[PDB]
Design a protein around this motif. Sequence first.
Motif, PDB file in Angstrom:
ATOM      1  N   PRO A  79       0.844  -1.210   0.000  1.00 21.89           N
ATOM      2  CA  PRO A  79       0.000   0.000   0.000  1.00 21.89           C
ATOM      3  C   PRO A  79       0.871   1.248   0.000  1.00 21.89           C
ATOM      4  N   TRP A  80       0.454   2.276  -0.719  1.00 19.99           N
ATOM      5  CA  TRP A  80       1.325   3.376  -0.996  1.00 19.99           C
ATOM      6  C   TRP A  80       1.855   4.051   0.250  1.00 19.99           C
ATOM      7  N   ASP A  81       1.019   4.234   1.280  1.00 20.79           N
ATOM      8  CA  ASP A  81       1.485   4.981   2.455  1.00 20.79           C
ATOM      9  C   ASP A  81       2.445   4.173   3.397  1.00 20.79           C
ATOM     10  N   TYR A  82       2.631   2.908   3.065  1.00 21.49           N
ATOM     11  CA  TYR A  82       3.759   2.125   3.585  1.00 21.49           C
ATOM     12  C   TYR A  82       4.958   2.121   2.635  1.00 21.49           C
ATOM     13  N   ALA A  83       4.754   1.612   1.416  1.00 19.91           N
ATOM     14  CA  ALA A  83       5.853   1.351   0.488  1.00 19.91           C
ATOM     15  C   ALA A  83       6.454   2.569  -0.192  1.00 19.91           C
ATOM     16  N   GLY A  84       5.617   3.568  -0.487  1.00 17.06           N
ATOM     17  CA  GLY A  84       6.017   4.689  -1.283  1.00 17.06           C
ATOM     18  C   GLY A  84       6.241   5.976  -0.518  1.00 17.06           C
ATOM     19  N   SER A  85       5.215   6.450   0.187  1.00 19.24           N
ATOM     20  CA  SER A  85       5.360   7.703   0.962  1.00 19.24           C
ATOM     21  C   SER A  85       6.020   7.463   2.297  1.00 19.24           C
ATOM     22  N   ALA A  86       5.966   6.227   2.806  1.00 18.77           N
ATOM     23  CA  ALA A  86       6.503   5.888   4.129  1.00 18.77           C
ATOM     24  C   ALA A  86       5.933   6.732   5.267  1.00 18.77           C
ATOM     25  N   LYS A  87       4.653   7.105   5.173  1.00 22.71           N
ATOM     26  CA  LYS A  87       3.984   7.666   6.308  1.00 22.71           C
ATOM     27  C   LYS A  87       3.912   6.649   7.434  1.00 22.71           C
ATOM     28  N   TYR A  88       3.749   5.385   7.066  1.00 23.56           N
ATOM     29  CA  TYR A  88       3.801   4.289   8.010  1.00 23.56           C
ATOM     30  C   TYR A  88       5.067   3.467   7.756  1.00 23.56           C
ATOM     31  N   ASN A  89       5.680   2.943   8.816  1.00 20.59           N
ATOM     32  CA  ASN A  89       6.933   2.245   8.642  1.00 20.59           C
ATOM     33  C   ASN A  89       6.944   0.792   9.084  1.00 20.59           C
ATOM     34  N   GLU A  90       5.767   0.236   9.317  1.00 23.10           N
ATOM     35  CA  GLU A  90       5.606  -1.195   9.526  1.00 23.10           C
ATOM     36  C   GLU A  90       4.514  -1.732   8.590  1.00 23.10           C
ATOM     37  N   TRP A  91       4.501  -3.046   8.375  1.00 23.44           N
ATOM     38  CA  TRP A  91       3.551  -3.676   7.463  1.00 23.44           C
ATOM     39  C   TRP A  91       3.265  -5.086   7.899  1.00 23.44           C
ATOM     40  N   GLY A  92       2.005  -5.474   7.763  1.00 24.44           N
ATOM     41  CA  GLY A  92       1.566  -6.818   8.043  1.00 24.44           C
ATOM     42  C   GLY A  92       1.058  -7.025   9.458  1.00 24.44           C
ATOM     43  N   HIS A  93       0.773  -8.289   9.739  1.00 23.41           N
ATOM     44  CA  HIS A  93       0.047  -8.680  10.920  1.00 23.41           C
ATOM     45  C   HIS A  93       0.821  -8.471  12.222  1.00 23.41           C
ATOM     46  N   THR A  94       2.148  -8.411  12.182  1.00 25.33           N
ATOM     47  CA  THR A  94       2.924  -8.078  13.385  1.00 25.33           C
ATOM     48  C   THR A  94       3.262  -6.599  13.522  1.00 25.33           C
ATOM     49  N   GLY A  95       2.965  -5.808  12.497  1.00 26.59           N
ATOM     50  CA  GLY A  95       3.206  -4.365  12.575  1.00 26.59           C
ATOM     51  C   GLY A  95       2.209  -3.664  13.474  1.00 26.59           C
ATOM     52  N   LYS A  96       2.653  -2.599  14.116  1.00 28.38           N
ATOM     53  CA  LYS A  96       1.743  -1.684  14.798  1.00 28.38           C
ATOM     54  C   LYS A  96       1.586  -0.354  14.042  1.00 28.38           C
TER      55      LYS A  96
END
Length: 389
Positions: free
Chosen positions: A245-262
């Motif tokens: 998703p863009w705000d994880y992979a591209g913009s990096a507004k979020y810096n974790e991904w998936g079921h263990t991410g917060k």
Amino acid sequence: RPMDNEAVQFGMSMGIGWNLGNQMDAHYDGCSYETGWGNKAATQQTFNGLAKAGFRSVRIPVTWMGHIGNAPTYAIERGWLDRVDELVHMAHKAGLIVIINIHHDGFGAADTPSKGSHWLDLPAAVASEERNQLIKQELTMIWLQIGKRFANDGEWLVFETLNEIQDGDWGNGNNRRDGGAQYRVLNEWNQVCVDAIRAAGGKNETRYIGVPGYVCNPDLTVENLVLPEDVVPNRLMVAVHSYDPWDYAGSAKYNEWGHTGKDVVPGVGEEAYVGMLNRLFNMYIRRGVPVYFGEFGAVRRASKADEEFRLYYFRYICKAMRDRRISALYWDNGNSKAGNDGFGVIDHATGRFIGNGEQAVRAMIDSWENNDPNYTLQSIYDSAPESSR
């Protein structure tokens, strides 16, 4: 099974590849220049580096704008075509499958350093059939020239017709409410490109040709792309891009991904990404039509704990792709930064790793390539890293 056919086998043979990004595609003030966005020029060592790392393919996006003569012949400047020719053959010398294209010619957003110079103009074509006719003539002349240069080069060389065609709103705009007019013209453009390539003679007759859907968006592709009518069977591939998703992979507004991410894009993780792949698998692969990601990736992170999530993302999605017989080429723009635009993992002139790029490159290639039936999506899932929040 159609998914076992020669075409899908060919798609899979691209494995995990790498984009020579922000390079022959780089431009400003209406002209492309290899070093224009700050990469040094590619060398044989670049392509040797890629093969040594385990990439099976390389995409060399090319922006033609500035090297195209006046109508009606739209003559391509020989020096420019020579460099494309040289790069292609360095890649071949390294044993890589090679994709070339028409790239930022068709950049359709407002934020361009070449305002006014993007001749490949989708809204302009939809507003005027006489403009659409002109754009199609230019596309034909360009692809004819490209094909004639490469007429003696075989099926290791793939032509991708166009890049990311859109109206500037990235698939959320008028394309959803204009009665499919934009999707129709894009379909016509792909037909015209395929026609031109096939008319260019020699080994262009049976070359694989990649064709994209609207802004390379997988769902808009599945939903609206029409595979061109071709002079031979089973020589088209569907090109798509994903930075999801863009705000994880591209913009990096979020810096974790998936079921263990917060610190995650809310409600968008593994299931979503697999769903998207499933749609491509069912529409294309299952029918014997190959699919490749012309571009995928996620930016680098400053924190080691965050970086582990990026590696997890690569392992998981690349495994999911392999399992669906989908190949993918990582977007590398040479930028060594963390966060937004931080995609550089291999130096574009030397072929050496940038920073900790080896770890990223290994995550993607080794997950796709793994041939152990006990290495599964579940095993990657269960090994996901611990949040640092």
